[PDB]
Amino acid sequence: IQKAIEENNNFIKMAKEKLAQKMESNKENREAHLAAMLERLQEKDKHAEEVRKNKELKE
Amino acid sequence: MREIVHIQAGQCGNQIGAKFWEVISDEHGIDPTGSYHGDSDLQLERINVYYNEAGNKYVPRAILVDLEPGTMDSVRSGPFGQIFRPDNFVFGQSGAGNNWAKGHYTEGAELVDSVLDVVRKESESCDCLQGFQLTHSLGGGTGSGMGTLLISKIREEYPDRIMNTFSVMPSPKVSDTVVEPYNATLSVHQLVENTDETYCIDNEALYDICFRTLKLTTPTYGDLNHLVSATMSGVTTCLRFPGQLNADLRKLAVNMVPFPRLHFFMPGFAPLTYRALTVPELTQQMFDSKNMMAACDPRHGRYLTVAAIFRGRMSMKEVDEQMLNVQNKNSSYFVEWIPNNVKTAVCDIPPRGLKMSATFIGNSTAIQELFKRISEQFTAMFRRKAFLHWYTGEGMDEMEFTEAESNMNDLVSEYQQYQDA
Ligand SMILES: Nc1nc2c(ncn2[C@@H]2O[C@H](COP(=O)(O)OP(=O)(O)O)[C@@H](O)[C@H]2O)c(=O)[nH]1
Ligand SMILES: COC(=O)Nc1nc2ccc(C(=O)c3ccccc3)cc2[nH]1
Numbered sequence: 001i002q003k004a005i006e007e008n009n010n011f012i013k014m015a016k017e018k019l020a021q022k023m024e025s026n027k028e029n030r031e032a033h034l035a036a037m038l039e040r041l042q043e044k045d046k047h048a049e050e051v052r053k054n055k056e057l058k059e
Numbered sequence: 060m061r062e063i064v065h066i067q068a069g070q071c072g073n074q075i076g077a078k079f080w081e082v083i084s085d086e087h088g089i090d091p092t093g094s095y096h097g098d099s100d101l102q103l104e105r106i107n108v109y110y111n112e113a114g115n116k117y118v119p120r121a122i123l124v125d126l127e128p129g130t131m132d133s134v135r136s137g138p139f140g141q142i143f144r145p146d147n148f149v150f151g152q153s154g155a156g157n158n159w160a161k162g163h164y165t166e167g168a169e170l171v172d173s174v175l176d177v178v179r180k181e182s183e184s185c186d187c188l189q190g191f192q193l194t195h196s197l198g199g200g201t202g203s204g205m206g207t208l209l210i211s212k213i214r215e216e217y218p219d220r221i222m223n224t225f226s227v228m229p230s231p232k233v234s235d236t237v238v239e240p241y242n243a244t245l246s247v248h249q250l251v252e253n254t255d256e257t258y259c260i261d262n263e264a265l266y267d268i269c270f271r272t273l274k275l276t277t278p279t280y281g282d283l284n285h286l287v288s289a290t291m292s293g294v295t296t297c298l299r300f301p302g303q304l305n306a307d308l309r310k311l312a313v314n315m316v317p318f319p320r321l322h323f324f325m326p327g328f329a330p331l332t333y334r335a336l337t338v339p340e341l342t343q344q345m346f347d348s349k350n351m352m353a354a355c356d357p358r359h360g361r362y363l364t365v366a367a368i369f370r371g372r373m374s375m376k377e378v379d380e381q382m383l384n385v386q387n388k389n390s391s392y393f394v395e396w397i398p399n400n401v402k403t404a405v406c407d408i409p410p411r412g413l414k415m416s417a418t419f420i421g422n423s424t425a426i427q428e429l430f431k432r433i434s435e436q437f438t439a440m441f442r443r444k445a446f447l448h449w450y451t452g453e454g455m456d457e458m459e460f461t462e463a464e465s466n467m468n469d470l471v472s473e474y475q476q477y478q479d480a
């Protein structure tokens with residue numbers, strides 16, 4: 001009976017941990033995916049400043 | 060006062076046990092209220108063996124055990140449901156799921172102490188306790204698993220008391236689940252160690268008898284149980300009624316069990332139920348394989364010991380003569396190294412609806428056929444570890460099954476030793 005309690009508790013434990021790791025790994029991946037997207041959009045915004053600066057010089 | 064304490068565990072155990080108390084309650088003149096209404100003082104001479112005396116009321120010394128309430132709720136509302144002491148109903152709610160491990164290790168462990176408390180209270184009120192009898196099946200979880208757990212606990216607390224069982228062996232012909240060979244194999248080893256007598260009631264035999272002999276196209280568990288209650292009545296006749304024999308459980312076992320592990324009996328009954336049978340017919344029937352409830356051919360083995368009780372009014376010079384004729388007919392099927400190993404007894408009181416009957420108790424080595432059958436079904440699944448997860452999930456290990464398998468094969472080889480000797 002002790003072995004039965006230990007196996008059930010170890011199954012509960014490993015599931016709780018497996019899930020906690022999946023949900024954190026997924027959070028980080030999604031946050032990184034969105035951060036890279038915006039970083040590309042900010043880079044375009046900077047490129048737009050250079051274009052508007054390049055116009056001013058020609059004047 | 061030579062009291063016996065009755066225990067019935069699980070669905071099968073409680074349903075045959077209930078019928079057993081219905082039958083003998085009628086034989087002793089006890090009505091569904093526990094009040095005596097008979098016409099003979101012989102009914103009351105040994106009433107204390109199975110009944111406690113309360114308002115001139117007689118209460119079965121019976122303990123009803125299960126891990127689910129269903130079957131015992133049905134007993135409490137049954138015909139004789141009210142005679143049982145309410146405090147002797149000890150049941151849980153979770154069930155055993157036809158799982159020996161649930162009955163023996165987990166669910167049953169949580170309930171066993173409560174059962175032993177009632178057993179103790181009943182044993183305490185015994186002037187001189189003969190021993191215990193248990194009704195149960197071996198193919199389920201509660202009767203098989205918790206029943207054998209109870210037997211182990213009872214032997215620890217009452218090591219010098221006789222423990223006899225009426226054990227229903229599983230058969231694929233009459234089966235509820237495929238794990239029955241697992242539960243039966245695990246239980247048999249428990250019985251090998253901790254019982255003095257085990258009556259092997261094979262559901263295959265009970266079915267064949269209902270179908271081929273009694274012409275019942277579709278037997279029910281109720282039909283099988285009429286055969287068991289009738290056999291149990293006969294097996295306990297010498298303990299319950301005055302007559303030739305006044306032996307207690309220990310003396311009865313001494314003369315029937317030559318080796319401690321070979322205590323598994325093949326019971327029989329005749330007539331199998333208006334023309335009252337002649338003594339030659341009673342005698343020939345109770346030795347016929349078709350009247351035996353173990354589904355073993357006695358001609359494939361040899362009798363170590365035989366006991367037979369005849370009930371009713373009859374000439375016993377005629378019985379002695381017929382018992383000689385049937386022994387001559389089966390002369391090569393009795394061991395020659397236990398002199399006078401076929402004994403006969405009489406009781407004047409017949410059972411209800413019969414002018415005379417006979418009950419057969421054989422200690423034959425042919426019973427190994429039953430254990431080999433169970434062992435073959437066990438191995439067929441265990442080779443592939445099929446359905447084992449139901450048991451490992453309750454903490455059991457593969458090794459425990461391997462050991463039960465080997466213990467079964469050792470039991471079978473021990474029978475083959477004395478069948479050749
Ligand atoms: N003769 C007989 N056998 C039964 C009865 N009920 C169940 N069985 C047998 O017992 C086994 C199932 O065990 P069961 O008693 O129902 O399980 P438990 O309640 O957990 O002990 C199977 O082999 C069935 O064939 C019954 O009323 N009569
Ligand atoms: C509750 O458990 C039992 O009843 N156990 C039990 N074992 C028995 C062994 C034999 C007999 C006989 O009837 C008998 C017939 C002829 C000669 C000698 C004995 C009855 C028994 N009952």
Ligand SMILES: [Ca+2]
Nearest residue numbers: 153165166169
């Ligand atoms: Ca619990």
Ligand SMILES: [Mg+2]
Nearest residue numbers: 070071199235
């Ligand atoms: Mg059942």
Ligand SMILES: [Mg+2]
Nearest residue numbers: 172173175176
């Ligand atoms: Mg306690």
